Amino acid sequence: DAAKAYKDYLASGGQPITNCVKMLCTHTGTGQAITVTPEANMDQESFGGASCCLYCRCHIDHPNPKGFCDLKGKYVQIPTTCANDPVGFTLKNTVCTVCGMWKGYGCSC
Amino acid sequence: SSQAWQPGVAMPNLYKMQRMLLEKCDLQNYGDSATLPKGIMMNVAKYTQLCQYLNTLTLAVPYNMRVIHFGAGSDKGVAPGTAVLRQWLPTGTLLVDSDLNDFVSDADSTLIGDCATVHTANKWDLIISDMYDPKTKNKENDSKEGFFTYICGFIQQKLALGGSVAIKITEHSWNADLYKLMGHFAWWTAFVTNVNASSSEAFLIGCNYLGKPREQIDGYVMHANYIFWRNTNPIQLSSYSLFDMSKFPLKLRGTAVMSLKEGQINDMILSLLSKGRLIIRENNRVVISSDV
Ligand SMILES: Nc1ncnc2c1c(C#Cc1cnc3ccccc3c1)cn2[C@@H]1O[C@H](CO)[C@@H](O)[C@H]1O
Ligand SMILES: [Zn+2]
Ligand SMILES: [Zn+2]
């Protein structure tokens, strides 16, 4: 399990994955977690989807049946406070199915 | 310093008309660095400014646009240029990128290997190249080849009429025929990014490929003219243009796509191509391979 492996490597004090591609945008977007365009708000940062996926970065198979990555080809918004480890944040958090925001970060449902 | 707010500076038509001997490039701003925004990669800033400048040109933007990006992998294993392109292009445009070494990309399809191994039975609407070998400067600066030979063939054989190109060059990484091929377009220039103004880097931008020469260009003379222009006109480094992104995405004009025989092409059609109002190619399914 790579997901559990990375969570443990962070807890051991290891440096988070770097070289996550941060985009330039107006920071006036909807704030939703995953979008086809950078939708970061003033409190968020927008990153390339492929660069923030552990399974894409490590050149391994994805945790799905059809080899579909929901990040690749799209943009993931990360809270600026958690911007030093975009890969970890996506691994540790879920997206509200109805409002499109992160559960616990911008979800009012 | 009005040009400091622009994405970059384009080669004036006056310097193109000259006939200069090639000389070494010595830039006043050499060694300087643009203070990039907090945590923004250089390729992100560079590609962003390039796309900003391209928005001022008469690019054809058909539905289901076909875009190909060469040399799209950086040493970090990611594809910063592809990220900007996907952000910049209309939703539904086919984006394919390639590089010699493996990398992770947000593009629809990624082809790994020497660019000469890329084969496609399809014409394309936009061609972007960042291909560059840091060891291509091997002691007289003569016309280079390699991936340039492929690029010129790709332009002449796999670029839809009315399509556009943006090919990276430097002082030593350049090609004479590519300069000549810029005359086959309705409009061309050399674009320098303000973030990378300290370098000899520039993007040869051809707009509205016409398939035949409207302007005869000596490749060797033109490169010397570009080198002369850079040596005489210092460019202030600037990342200011990166802070205005509201109008960044490429306006989708729904440009017409028509398959036309070469005999059907006349002056009226050429005027349409020159204005970014027409693309001539097949609308079939896109097939692209990377030999192994
Ligand atoms: N053929 C290629 N196919 C795909 N991508 C490519 C290349 C290439 C070349 C070359 C090359 C290298 N030595 C040579 C020596 C004598 C003559 C010609 C030469 C040509 C550079 N790139 C990528 O362009 C990015 C920008 O630096 C880099 O990521 C680099 O990986
Ligand atoms: Zn993935
Ligand atoms: Zn919710």
A47, A85 contact by CB (below 8 A): no
| DSSP track, B102-119 | ----SSSEEEES-GGGEE
Experimental method: X-ray
User: A107 to chain B nearest CA, in Å?
Assistant: 25
Q: Rounded to an integer, what distance in angstroms lies between the CA atom of residue B127 and that of residue B75?
A: 22
Relative to the CA of B147, which ligand 1 atom is closest? 1
Chain-centroid distance, C-alpha B176: 16
User: B87 to chain A nearest CA, in Å?
Assistant: 6
Relative to the CA of B168, which ligand 1 atom is closest? 26
B174, B151 contact by CB (below 8 A): no
Tokens of B234: 């210092």
B190, B202 contact by CB (below 8 A): yes
C-beta neighbour count of B216 within 10 angstroms:
7
Contacts of A42 in chain B (CB under 8 A): none
Q: Rounded to an integer, what distance in angstroms lies between the CA atom of residue B123 and that of residue B273?
A: 15
Q: Work out whether the CA dihedral B243, B249, B251, B256 comes out positive or negative.
A: positive
Task: Mark residue B177 as left, alpha or beta (left: phi above 0; alpha: psi -120 to 50; beta: remaining).
Answer: alpha
Interface of B with A in 72-131 (CB under 8 A): 76-80, 83-84, 86-87, 91, 102, 104-108
Query: Could A57 and B104 be called an inter-chain contact, meaning their C-beta atoms sit closer than 8 Å?
Result: yes
- Is the CB of A94 inside 8 Å of chain B's CB atoms? no
Tokens of B290: 């990377």
Q: Rounded to an integer, what distance in angstroms lies between the CA atom of residue B126 and that of residue B85?
A: 11
What does chain A come to in residues?
109
**What DSSP character marks residue A79?**
E
Q: Rounded to an integer, what distance in angstroms lies between the CA atom of residue B47 and that of residue B144?
A: 24
Write the residue in B78, B106, B246 that is nearest to A73 by C-beta: B106
Q: Rounded to an integer, what distance in angstroms lies between the CA atom of residue A27 and that of residue A14?
A: 30
B225, B15 contact by CB (below 8 A): yes
Q: Rounded to an integer, what distance in angstroms lies between the CA atom of residue B230 and that of residue B227?
A: 5
Interface of A with B in 70-89 (CB under 8 A): 72-75, 83
B71, B32 contact by CB (below 8 A): no
Give the bridge partners for B111, in sequence order: B98
B97, A73 contact by CB (below 8 A): no
* Annotation says B130 is catalytic: yes
Pairing between β-strand B109-112 and β-strand B94-99 as defined by DSSP bridges: parallel
Tell me how many degrees the CA angle B17-B19-B23 measures, rounded to the nearest 5.
125
Contacts of B78 in chain A (CB under 8 A): 19-21, 48, 50-51
- Is the CB of B41 inside 8 Å of chain A's CB atoms? yes
- Is the CB of B44 inside 8 Å of chain A's CB atoms? yes
Q: Rounded to an integer, what distance in angstroms lies between the CA atom of residue B200 and that of residue B168?
A: 10
Query: Could B242 and A24 be called an inter-chain contact, meaning their C-beta atoms sit closer than 8 Å?
Result: yes
Please return the burial class of A60, using the count of CB atoms within 10 Å of its CB with bins 0-12, 13-18 and 19+: exposed
Q: Can you give the C-alpha Rg of chain B in angstroms? A: 18
Q: What is the SS3 assignment for B285?
A: coil
Q: Rounded to an integer, what distance in angstroms lies between the CA atom of residue B227 and that of residue B200?
A: 8
Element (H, E) at B202: strand B202-209
Angle of helix B42-54 relative to helix B80-88, nearest 10 degrees? 30
Counting ligands in written order, the one closest to the CA of A87 is: 2
**A13-16 long-range Cβ contacts below 8 angstroms, 24+ apart:** A16/A84, A16/A85, A16/A87, A16/A88
- Of B83, B72, B107, the closest CA to residue B93 belongs to B107
B95, B89 contact by CB (below 8 A): yes
Residues within 6 Å of ligand 1 by CB:
B 71, 73-74, 98-101, 114-115, 130-133, 136, 146-147
The secondary structure of chain B in percent helix, strand, coil, rounded to multiples of 5, reads 30, 25, 50
- Of B82, B75, B81, B78, the closest CA to residue B108 belongs to B82
Q: Rounded to an integer, what distance in angstroms lies between the CA atom of residue B109 and that of residue B95?
A: 7
Q: What is the SS3 assignment for B126?
A: strand
- Is the CB of B137 inside 8 Å of chain A's CB atoms? no
Tell me how many degrees the CA angle A33-A35-A38 measures, rounded to the nearest 5.
95
Chain position carrying tokens 């332009």:
B155
Q: Rounded to an integer, what distance in angstroms lies between the CA atom of residue A47 and that of residue B23?
A: 42
